[PDB]
Each structure stands twice: as structure tokens, then as C-alpha cells.
């Protein structure tokens, strides 16, 4: 209890550095975009961002090894700049809301049908989500705990009417303000999964009476934990970029895979975005029971781990996981879900700082590494009609002090976030 | 049949003259958008384009002004110029490129073997294909059953090195058996091509599709849909390079993204494709799984769901013939009358398309271009940019008579 209770010290102690760090350094990204909007900055060079990444695509047209490029002038590059500042603003917002609530909000995505739905129930012990052979998941699935909800077994489906968008729609629902979502039971949730057209959020409210609390998810006594079921990858364009947006107002992702296509390519999409924020996710990889060359694919798998995000890899004994239960507490083991849920307990309720804080100060790493990239390269560059030219010198140095005094603030700001210490547990 | 060919001859010439002519349409308009930028809407609106749509992705990310738009669609102008390359090759060739491709794991190789009733190309459970496997019939390279393994170092990219590739020119190609086929074709970092030359006598040339005596006939196994982004980059490019195309679907997942995002874009030109639902075994909703495939049949290619009969077949037949097939017979029967008898439908049709599409966009471009400079800043400034308003209106009013009339030469090209 002891170690218990300097963890928690701990924890809320980084939580207020994160916070700072988090309102410091949206003012440094607020600087740029004052700047930028006054006089366009350099995004142009001839290695990469890790965030603040400019990349063009044209919609339905493959470079196979094409020069992309396109050569753009500056201040039109600039203008698309501004949208990638918005983007990142919004995401930082995401993060600093997380770090202020106390939740764990877990999110279980991969491709279509490879069992993110089975997972979930499997976390359960009880058969609450529909599973289905063929696309089922097509609305997101939040179970939470029946103390919200007043002790109430029921399905609070979240209308798309009630808001231009989706996350809207989400955010205005309460629970003492009806109308902005529909009471349904437990058992219509076959009927209400697949309706992505009418509802944007199920409020799944269950109680975890099955199993004890020592060993239940929902039910620990410690930490508020949310369990979100995903839509599957590679279905729908917008369907995928909904999951895109999921991805940063969740804590922790685990992530399915299918064992006979190892990662896809739309999987690799999503993990290399979550890969901005979160070192470290969840790999299950189900359907594992059908391979027969597990040891070929075995080694497949890890190897694109590796790549993808090194830190996973490094510690994939606890987050690198082979189960193949599928469509509870029978007299057979099944020892495989019980190291991930053990894994999966150990990390989330023991280690705060790593599962809900460590996002945080890896965005903040990535994104002032960016602002410093991007300082250095104006340097360089500002410092290289007769009458516009007495004004184009005097704004010339009117931003090299700009971006000598962000770069300056920001080689400060990324020293002092690493002195953050989230691997105390 | 002695009168049939000759329509068939006469409307490859009248095809070949029209791609000729769209060429240098698509010449001068990239020349004209290089020295003035041109008009264009970003989103749909309305009257949008079929080839020439200009869509905007900011990658990793539920604006832009005239001059960046332009060098925007140039780089469409270029993709639409080497489509038509493409499609002129083709008219060319006397043989019909067969595409069979799809989503990994969905059972392109295992596809191909049984059209050719033999295990040849390497079947695995895991991701396997990764180099295009082209099957020819071994009378081209001197009845030598063997594997001409392209090198990819041997040109720059990808592309201009399968059109090096000469039978003639030792070492442009690596000679192999068969046998060693499993531990070519994952090395898409050494090989740009396989070259698989095999013997169709394993049945009588009435019932072969490669030793059919009436039509040359080239047999690709594609590597996997949604794996590797350039991988997928090279399976766009293979489509504007083959006849026709054999989608395989995994029956449990229907038509994916990656799966939509192949046949949206090859139903720029191919109205008609097969669709191939392999693993249908393993499927408890048969009924339902069914119905899930044809309506995305029916908004990705209508053409094809009203002829699902002859194109859409749901075959059982897999890999793990050393007693025939009902439903995989009606596979081949159909796709043996596509490739060899339907030659104007399965081989001219897609010149035709494209170009009925593109000069259509072309016509809407030049039209638009034209009323919209005619709506209207230092003084040297204003009598240049003046002059370059006349000079573009001068060349849409040029283009927009030109392509209105090869619009016309299009659509009298009578097929059926
Ligand atoms: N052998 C095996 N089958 C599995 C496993 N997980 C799921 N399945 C089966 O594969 C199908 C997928 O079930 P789901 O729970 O709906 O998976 P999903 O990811 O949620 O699919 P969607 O929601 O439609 O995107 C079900 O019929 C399961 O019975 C597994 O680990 N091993
Ligand atoms: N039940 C069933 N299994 C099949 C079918 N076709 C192939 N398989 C099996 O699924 C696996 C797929 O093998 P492949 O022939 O290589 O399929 P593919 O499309 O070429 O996959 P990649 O080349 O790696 O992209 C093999 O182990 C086959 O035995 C089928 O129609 N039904
Ligand atoms: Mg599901
Ligand atoms: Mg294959
Ligand atoms: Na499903
Ligand atoms: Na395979």
C-alpha cells in the first residue's frame, strides 16, 4: 500500500507537469500560427517530421515511385500549413483532456473480423457484444460500469441527428439530459451495432457482477475504466477515419490482429498514427489456432512489431499476446487470455504514469522536435521593384528574431519535458 | 465468324486513331496548363469529371488558390497521358492480358493453378505473392519450360524494366526452373517480373485457356491488396496494362476498402470484370454473405451485376487435381467465352470507355475554362494578363471544338 500510495503521489504530481508542459506548449504552437498567418514560414526542404508533417495526396492516384513534391510556392504551401496547425491544436486539447480525467478509456481496433467484439466479451467473461462472421461492428461500443447509470442494465444509443458531427454528438450526451440518446436493453444490441447511419455512440451500461471484483476489468475499485469496441479497419473510407479520430480521446489501444494476414496495410496505417502519442499498445493476435507454420508467422508478426513501434517490441512480454478463444469461465484454462489479462491489469490499474500518462509526454517530445526542425530550417533560410525591397529585408528580420526566440524556447521546452519521469513503476 | 473478325480489325484501327487524337488532346492541354494555369473545382459540386477529378488528401490528417491547384492537376494530366499510353498498347497486342488480383489471402495463386489445372504457382496460407507471376505458353520461348526472373536493378524503376525485358537480350532476365518458383516470388525487392513459361497439355485445347489455338492468352497472379503501399502502387499500375481483370473476393470480409478502391478505379475504363468469392465454404450466412457481394457489385459496376451469371461465381475449389467442379466449370465456360469469343467486348470495350469518359471531361473543362475567363493591379501587369486571357480563351475555344467532334467518332464506333 505503500508503494501503492507513492504511485498515486506519483501519478498526480506528473499529471500536473504534463498539464503544464501541454498548456506551454500550445503557446509556443499559437506563436507559429500567429507568425505564419502575418508572414508565411518555410515548410519546404530537400529528415522528415514526426507530427507537423506536410504530405500531399491526390485522392484515387497512386505514386508508384513518382517525385510527389509538386513544387508548390511558398505561400500556398503555407495556407495548407494552417490546417495542420488546427489538426495538432485539436489533438493536444484531446491529450490535456485525457491527462485532467482519471479514467482509462482502452480502445480494442484492428481489421474487419479479426475479434476485436470476441476480445471484449472475453474481458467480461459474458456474451454482451454481438459477434458475427461477417461485418458486424459498425457503430463504436463503449462499455462502462452501472454506478454512471444508477445501477440501471440498459443501452443508451447516442443519435447523429443532435449534432453536425460525430465527436458533437458524443460530447453533448448526459445522461440527465434526455433525448440526446435512446433507451434500448441489452438484447437489441444485435439490431443497433450496424446502424452507423442513425446512431454515432452505444452507452453500453453493465454490471460486472460475473467474477469476482480482485479479478473482474470493469470492477477493480481503483480506476474508472472504459471499454470501447471499434468498427472494423479497411470497410468504409469514413468508417476509418472515424477510428482515426477515436484513437486520440483513448488511453490505450489494443490492437487485433488476424494471424494469417499478420498487419495489414490499413492496420499499419492506424498504428503508425497512434505511433505520434502512444510507445506502447496491446498486440492480440487471434485466429492463431488455424496458422499451422506458427513459427514462421510467429516471427512475421514481431518482426513488423519491431518496426512499427520498437518500444512494444521491446517489452512485448507484456504486450505482445496470442490468443485464440473465440466465440465463458469454462473448466479449461485457456492460459493464454489470462496472461493478457493479467498483463493487461498489471498495466493499467499498477502503472498510471506509463498506461495514461506516457502519451502525453511522447506527443510533447515529437511535437517540439518538430517546432525545432522547423525553427532551424527558416533560420537558415530567412538569413538568405527596389522599392518592395526596403520592406521584403525589414520582414525578413522581423521573423528571423521570431524564429530565433522559438527555437531557443523550444530546445528549452523538449530538455524540460524528458525530465519527466513516467517509468517510476 | 470469317465477317465477324473483320469488324473486329476495322474497329481496332478505328480505336487506334481516336487514342492518337485524345493523346495529343491531353498534349495541349498540359502544355497549355504549364504557360497559364487552367480552371478547376476541388470537390464534387456538380457536373463533376469522371478521369479528371481533381480530390485533395492531406496524408496522416471526418485554402488553395489557382496557381497550386494547376500544379495539382498537372501531375493528373501526366497519370491520364500514361493511361493512354497504356490503353495504346494494348490495342496493339493481339493477346488479352488476364489480371487476377485481389485483397492477400483471398486466393489469386490458388485461382490460377486451377485454370491451368496444375500446382504451379507457390500456394501459402501466409502472405506469399509478392512479384507480379505472368504465365505465358511455352512456344514463345522455344518450348523451354522455364522462369525468366526479371531483375529490377536493371533499370531505374519498376515499369520500364518489364519493357526491357527481351528474350533475346542475355541477362536482361535470370534463367530458373520451376521448382524454385516458392523462393522467387517473395523477393519483390530483387524482381520486377516472373516470366513462367508452361505447357498447357494437362487438357485438350478445346477445354485449355492458354493452349486455345484462337486467342493468345497471358495469365498474371498478382501480389496482395492491402499489404505494402507501393506494392499496392504497382497493382494500380499493372491494371492500365492488362485486358482484363479477375477480382477475387474472400467471401467472410465481402469487398473491402482496399478491395473497392482497385475496381472504383479499374471501372474508369473495364465496365465488366469477373468476381471470383473464394473461401465461400467456410461461410455460415450463405444467403446473407451472398446478397452483401451483389449490392456492392451493383454500385461498384452495373454493368457487371447484370450479367452477375456470367462474371460473379462463388467457388469452393481450393487449394489444400493431383472429379470435376460444377460451379467452378461455369467459371471457366464463362471466362472462356469472355476471352475468346466476346474479343470486341472483353478487349476494345475499355479503349472505348476511357475515351468516351475522358473526352468528356475534356469537353466540360474547355467549356468551363471559357465562360469563366469571360467575366472580366499595377498597369504593366493588367495588359499581359490581359493578352494571356485571349490567348487561353483563343485555345479552349480550340479544344472544346476539337474534342466535342472526337466525342462524336467515339460513340459511332459501333461494337455489338
Ligand atoms: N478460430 C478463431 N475464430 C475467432 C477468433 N475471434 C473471433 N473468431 C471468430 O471470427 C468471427 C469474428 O467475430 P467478431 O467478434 O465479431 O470479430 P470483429 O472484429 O468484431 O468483426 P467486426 O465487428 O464485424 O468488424 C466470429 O465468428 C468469431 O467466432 C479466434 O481468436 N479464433
Ligand atoms: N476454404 C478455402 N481455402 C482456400 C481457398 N483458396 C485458397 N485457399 C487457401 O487459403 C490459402 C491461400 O493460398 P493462396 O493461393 O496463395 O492465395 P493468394 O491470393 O494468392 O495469397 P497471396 O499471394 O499471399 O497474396 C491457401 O492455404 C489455400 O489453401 C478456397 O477457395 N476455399
Ligand atoms: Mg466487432
Ligand atoms: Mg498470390
Ligand atoms: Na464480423
Ligand atoms: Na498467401
Redesign the pocket.
Known sequence: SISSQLSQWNYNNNRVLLKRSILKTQAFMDQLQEENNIRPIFIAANEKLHVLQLNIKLDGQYNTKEKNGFNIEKKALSKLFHSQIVSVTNHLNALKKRVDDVSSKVFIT?D???????LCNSLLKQRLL????????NVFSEILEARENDGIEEVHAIPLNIAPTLKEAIDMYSIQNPKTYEIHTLKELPDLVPQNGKYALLKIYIKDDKRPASTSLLRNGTVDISLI?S??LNMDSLQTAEVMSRQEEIDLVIF?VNAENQLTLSAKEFISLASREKKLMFFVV??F??IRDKQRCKELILKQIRDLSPETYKRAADFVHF?????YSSSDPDPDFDSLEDSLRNFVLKKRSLSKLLPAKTYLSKLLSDIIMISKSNMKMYSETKKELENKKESNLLSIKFFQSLYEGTVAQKLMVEEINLDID
Open positions: 484492428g474487419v473480423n479479426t475479434g476485436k467484439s470476441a454481438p459477434e458475427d462472421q461477417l461485418p458486424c461492428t469496441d468498427p472494423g487485433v487471434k485466429k489456432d488455424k490468443v485464440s478463444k473465440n466465440g
